[PDB]
Amino acid sequence: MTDSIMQNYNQLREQVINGDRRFQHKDGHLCFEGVDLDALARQYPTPFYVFSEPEIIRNIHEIQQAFAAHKNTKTFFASKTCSVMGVLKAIRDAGICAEANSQYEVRKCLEIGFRGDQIVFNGVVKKPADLEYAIANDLYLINVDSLYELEHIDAISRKLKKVANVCVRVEPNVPSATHAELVTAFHAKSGLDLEQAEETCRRILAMPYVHLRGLHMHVGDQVPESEPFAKATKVLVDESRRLEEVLGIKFDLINVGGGIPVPYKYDDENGDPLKDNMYAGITAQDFADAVIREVHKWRTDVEICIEPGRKVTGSAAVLLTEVSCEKRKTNYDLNGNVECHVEWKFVDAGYSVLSDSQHFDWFFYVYNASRMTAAHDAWIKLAGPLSDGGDYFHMGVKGEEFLLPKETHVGDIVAFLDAGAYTIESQTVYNNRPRTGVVMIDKNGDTRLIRREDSYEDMVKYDIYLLAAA
Amino acid sequence: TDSIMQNYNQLREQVINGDRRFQHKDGHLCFEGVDLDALARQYPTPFYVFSEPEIIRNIHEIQQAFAAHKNTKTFFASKTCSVMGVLKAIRDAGICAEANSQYEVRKCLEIGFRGDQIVFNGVVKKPADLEYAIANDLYLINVDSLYELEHIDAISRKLKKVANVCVRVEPNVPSATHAELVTAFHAKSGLDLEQAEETCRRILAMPYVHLRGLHMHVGDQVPESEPFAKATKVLVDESRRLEEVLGIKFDLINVGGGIPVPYKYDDENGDPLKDNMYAGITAQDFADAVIREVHKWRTDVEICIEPGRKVTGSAAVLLTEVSCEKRKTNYDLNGNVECHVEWKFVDAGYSVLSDSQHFDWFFYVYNASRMTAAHDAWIKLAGPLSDGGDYFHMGVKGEEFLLPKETHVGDIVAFLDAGAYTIESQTVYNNRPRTGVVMIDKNGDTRLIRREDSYEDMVKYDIYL
Numbered sequence: 025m026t027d028s029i030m031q032n033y034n035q036l037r038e039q040v041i042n043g044d045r046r047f048q049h050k051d052g053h054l055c056f057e058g059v060d061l062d063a064l065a066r067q068y069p070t071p072f073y074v075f076s077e078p079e080i081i082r083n084i085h086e087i088q089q090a091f092a093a094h095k096n097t098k099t100f101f102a103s104k105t106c107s108v109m110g111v112l113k114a115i116r117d118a119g120i121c122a123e124a125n126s127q128y129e130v131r132k133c134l135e136i137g138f139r140g141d142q143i144v145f146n147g148v149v150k151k152p153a154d155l156e157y158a159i160a161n162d163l164y165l166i167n168v169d170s171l172y173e174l175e176h177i178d179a180i181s182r183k184l185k186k187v188a189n190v191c192v193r194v195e196p197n198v199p200s201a202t203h204a205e206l207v208t209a210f211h212a213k214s215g216l217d218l219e220q221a222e223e224t225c226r227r228i229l230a231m232p233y234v235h236l237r238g239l240h241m242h243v244g245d246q247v248p249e250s251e252p253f254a255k256a257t258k259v260l261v262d263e264s265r266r267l268e269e270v271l272g273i274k275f276d277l278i279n280v281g282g283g284i285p286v287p288y289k290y291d292d293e294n295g296d297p298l299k300d301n302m303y304a305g306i307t308a309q310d311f312a313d314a315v316i317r318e319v320h321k322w323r324t325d326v327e328i329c330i331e332p333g334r335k336v337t338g339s340a341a342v343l344l345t346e347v348s349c350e351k352r353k354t355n356y357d358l359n360g361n362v363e364c365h366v367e368w369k370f371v372d373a374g375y376s377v378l379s380d381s382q383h384f385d386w387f388f389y390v391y392n393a394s395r396m397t398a399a400h401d402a403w404i405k406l407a408g409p410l411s412d413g414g415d416y417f418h419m420g421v422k423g424e425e426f427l428l429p430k431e432t433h434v435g436d437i438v439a440f441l442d443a444g445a446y447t448i449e450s451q452t453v454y455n456n457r458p459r460t461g462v463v464m465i466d467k468n469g470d471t472r473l474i475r476r477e478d479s480y481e482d483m484v485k486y487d488i489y490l491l492a493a494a
Numbered sequence: 495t496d497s498i499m500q501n502y503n504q505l506r507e508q509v510i511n512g513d514r515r516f517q518h519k520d521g522h523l524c525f526e527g528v529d530l531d532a533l534a535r536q537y538p539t540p541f542y543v544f545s546e547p548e549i550i551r552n553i554h555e556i557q558q559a560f561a562a563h564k565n566t567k568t569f570f571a572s573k574t575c576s577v578m579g580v581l582k583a584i585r586d587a588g589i590c591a592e593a594n595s596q597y598e599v600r601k602c603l604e605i606g607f608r609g610d611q612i613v614f615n616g617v618v619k620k621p622a623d624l625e626y627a628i629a630n631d632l633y634l635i636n637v638d639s640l641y642e643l644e645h646i647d648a649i650s651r652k653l654k655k656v657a658n659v660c661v662r663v664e665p666n667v668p669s670a671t672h673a674e675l676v677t678a679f680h681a682k683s684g685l686d687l688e689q690a691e692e693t694c695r696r697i698l699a700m701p702y703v704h705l706r707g708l709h710m711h712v713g714d715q716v717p718e719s720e721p722f723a724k725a726t727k728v729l730v731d732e733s734r735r736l737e738e739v740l741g742i743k744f745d746l747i748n749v750g751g752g753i754p755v756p757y758k759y760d761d762e763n764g765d766p767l768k769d770n771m772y773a774g775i776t777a778q779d780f781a782d783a784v785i786r787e788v789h790k791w792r793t794d795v796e797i798c799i800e801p802g803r804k805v806t807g808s809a810a811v812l813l814t815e816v817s818c819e820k821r822k823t824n825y826d827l828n829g830n831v832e833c834h835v836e837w838k839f840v841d842a843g844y845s846v847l848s849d850s851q852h853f854d855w856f857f858y859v860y861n862a863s864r865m866t867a868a869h870d871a872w873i874k875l876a877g878p879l880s881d882g883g884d885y886f887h888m889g890v891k892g893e894e895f896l897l898p899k900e901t902h903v904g905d906i907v908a909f910l911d912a913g914a915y916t917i918e919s920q921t922v923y924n925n926r927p928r929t930g931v932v933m934i935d936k937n938g939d940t941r942l943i944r945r946e947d948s949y950e951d952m953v954k955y956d957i958y959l
């Protein structure tokens with residue numbers, strides 16, 4: 025079976041450079057929208073991320089095509105997924121809107137060109153200063169998370185004499201087959217209890233500068249099944265319908281959140297999405313079909329807002345990291361007898377550069393971009409440069425082991441695929457390694473830097489100290 | 495439960511009545527005489543406050559531990575915290591510095607550590623990194639691979655500057671810390687022990703590489719003395735043997751770091767070998783084991799140690815403002831009520847205090863604004879991030895913490911023992927800024943030593959029109 029695993033992985037390798045809309049090969053190198061990534065990793069210092077604006081556009085089209093059966097849909101990119109300004113601008117250019125989770129996320133969306141009526145503000149903590157900024161900028165929605173926050177919205181909206189447009193976020197009591205930390209609709213810190221929606225909405229109606237637009241929920245992240253979306257949307261729809269009758273109102277909209285999964289493992293025939301959510305399980309079309317069906321049982325004219333994040337960018341980046349050292353190690357037992365030997369390959373990216381590979385057991389395809397057409401036929405362990413004993417990549421092809429060509433040598437470029445969601449803002453300067461540069465491939469296939477690597481002077485500029493040596 | 499609550503409040507009283515770091519005044523938690531509620535009104539929360547006096551106390555513990563061995567050299571592992579004012583306090587306390595990257599070496603030099611006070615560790619030292627170290631006359635480069643040693647030979651020859659090295663070896667010694675924190679067993683780091691002899695033979699023959707000794711590091715937060723005793727004995731036996739074989743006298747032996755810090759103080763209720771939030775040993779037990787083994791061989795040789803966590807761990811407190819609150823209902827998959835949860839939201843989440851989420855790390859949590867009030871209410875403590883999992887799971891009982899029932903939005907919550915591995919691991923996830931850092935100096939005065947990331951700082955890395 026360990027040869028079949030190896031055989032299967034190289035079947036996947038050949039699929040990347042043969043039937044993948046993102047990738048080709050040239051001179052034995054992995055290519056991304058026609059850009060030789062080996063050559064690219066010689067022009068910029070590794071490790072760095074390369075994003076594909078073509079692939080962002082493709083993903084966005086998939087999301088929008090998915091909702092064709094409901095004309096009045098509004099799509100808000102969850103900027104928490106990636107808020108590099110060049111990536112935000114590409115998403116604005118593609119024609120959808122923006123969702124933000126903090127005052128500075130709202131500000132950067134405004135700065136990059138999203139209008140206030142293109143921005144939704146989510147979050148379990150919106151301090152008075154955050155609310156005042158949001159209300160002064162005529163945000164499309166502030167998705168109210170608590171009665172405490174609502175009291176501030178009432179007072180600040182009156183103070184500003186500006187209408188605050190709100191959804192009431194409710195927990196629909198719907199679990200999902202994703203990471204425990206990634207469920208947000210079941211025993212959650214976020215949202216009001218469903219039971220509190222009625223009186224909350226009633227009070228918003230009486231508030232002169234707070235305009236109730238609808239109800240909000242968000243199921244979770246990387247949800248690999250359509251049923252949670254159907255169940256949760258039904259809860260929201262049923263309460264929306266009931267409140268319309270009870271309160272004598274007509275809701276502008278309903279906001280069903282995000283959570284469309286992205287494939288991080290592609291050989292679906294070998295995977296069970298309900299046991300391993302690296303298998304996506306559903307497409308954007310399944311998500312749309314589930315949401316739209318439930319909403320249409322209530323109104324076909326109401327506006328549906330969605331908040332996809334991961335799906336917009338997840339598949340649209342690659343992490344490029346150079347093999348920087350190598351060693352063979354012996355593993356002994358407690359009495360000093362050999363157990364095995366381990367071929368360690370060290371790349372210049374650790375978990376401070378790719379957080380979820382460590383902290384959320386996230387799988388990304390790993391290939392030798394310099395030897396993309398070579399058989400990946402050696403079992404190796406892939407370590408980062410950090411001090412932590414545990415800074416190596418545990419989510420291997422088999423156990424903690426990866427497959428690379430037996431010819432791999434120091435200086436080869438290793439590529440992590442599907443590296444575009446939740447990979448940039450989560451970086452650290454642990455061990456004072458810099459956070460990575462970020463390169464963008466535009467619609468013409470041309471590359472440019474859209475974020476610099478942190479410089480040394482960046483490592484210290486935040487500190488206040490007396491310099492001792494120049 | 496009632497017992498857990500009484501025990502937690504006995505611990506609370508001990509914080510303000512029998513802890514060298516803390517007092518109470520006006521009902522508020524004080525740190526070295528500084529009112530932390532008052533301090534949190536002067537700076538935007540969340541932020542960290544470090545105590546230079548406690549850093550000094552910790553270094554004194556470490557150096558008093560080694561009183562039986564005159565020639566001991568102590569290198570603060572700067573990966574623990576390299577805020578420049580923290581490095582300055584450590585430098586001013588009189589010990590040395592260890593670095594894990596070219597930029598760590600540079601900031602150590604810039605803040606005033608001399609080259610001869612700096613050890614460079616790392617499994618990846620690229621030629622540019624090695625050249626920078628060699629050019630700066632570092633006391634040690636702890637060689638981690640033969641591949642790296644070949645670059646050291648060539649660069650040292652090219653610069654005509656002597657490179658001072660240890661050979662790091664894996665001692666084959668497991669330890670009862672986190673799997674991710676073991677570094678002396680099945681590790682990515684070090685050479686196999688059998689490779690030491692030939693590697694040392696070849697270094698001797700290199701004209702611009704000087705062999706100082708052997709190096710190992712057992713792990714981080716090691717709750718037991720036996721692994722250090724056993725790993726040191728391995729290094730000492732092989733140091734003795736190579737001295738005989740090669741006819742040399744080693745400069746030193748470097749036994750690394752790993753002195754644990756108490757994150758739970760009620761040791762009478764603790765199993766350190768299952769829950770290493772209990773420290774299990776002290777610096778003195780660490781020194782006793784190391785010195786006991788080295789002294790079977792040489793009493794004159796220099797012992798190098800690389801403590802990180804022990805220097806700063808106990809010397810900081812994360813201050814975070816209660817910023818929202820709500821009560822929720824947890825239902826089962828049949829609409830039946832399971833329980834009722836009181837959520838308190840602070841303005842710090844795991845992007846500020848990484849290890850509370852990513853390594854299941856426990857820190858004492860108290861209401862600094864109501865530190866003299868009974869912590870008599872069961873709450874769940876959430877951060878502000880989008881993630882549903884951004885709440886503090888390492889509670890007083892399960893995922894539940896105790897705070898005064900009087901707790902209000904605007905109160906200041908303190909996380910204790912927040913001084914190790916808490917700053918450089920922060921992120922700007924959700925575009926919340928990495929925190930400011932305040933230092934209480936030796937005279938009890940406060941000053942900002944790191945600014946909170948501003949909006950501008952965070953967009954400044956991007957290249958856009």
Ligand SMILES: Cc1ncc(COP(=O)(O)O)c(CN)c1O
Pocket residue numbers: 102104105123146208241242244245246281282283284331332333334335880881
């Ligand atoms: C309220 C809300 N909206 C949308 C999203 C986006 O999630 P995803 O990236 O999985 O689409 C999130 C992030 N979990 C969220 O918290």
Ligand SMILES: Cc1ncc(COP(=O)(O)O)c(CN)c1O
Pocket residue numbers: 411412571574615677711713714715750751752753800801802803804
């Ligand atoms: C080589 C080396 N020495 C010293 C340390 C510091 O360890 P600690 O903070 O547990 O004392 C580390 C990090 N575990 C290390 O990798």
Ligand SMILES: N=C(N)NCCCC=O
Pocket residue numbers: 411412413573675714849853915
């Ligand atoms: N999360 C932490 N503290 N990791 C590092 C432990 C020491 C290793 O370098």
Ligand SMILES: N=C(N)NCCCC=O
Pocket residue numbers: 104205206245380384446450880881882
């Ligand atoms: N680090 C990750 N991916 N967290 C969950 C992402 C969605 C939550 O907001």
Ligand SMILES: [Cl-]
Pocket residue numbers: 566567568569588589590
């Ligand atoms: Cl010293």
Ligand code: NA
Pocket residue numbers: 228229230231232233234235236
């Ligand atoms: Na109103």
Ligand code: NA
Pocket residue numbers: 697698699700701702703704705
């Ligand atoms: Na020599």
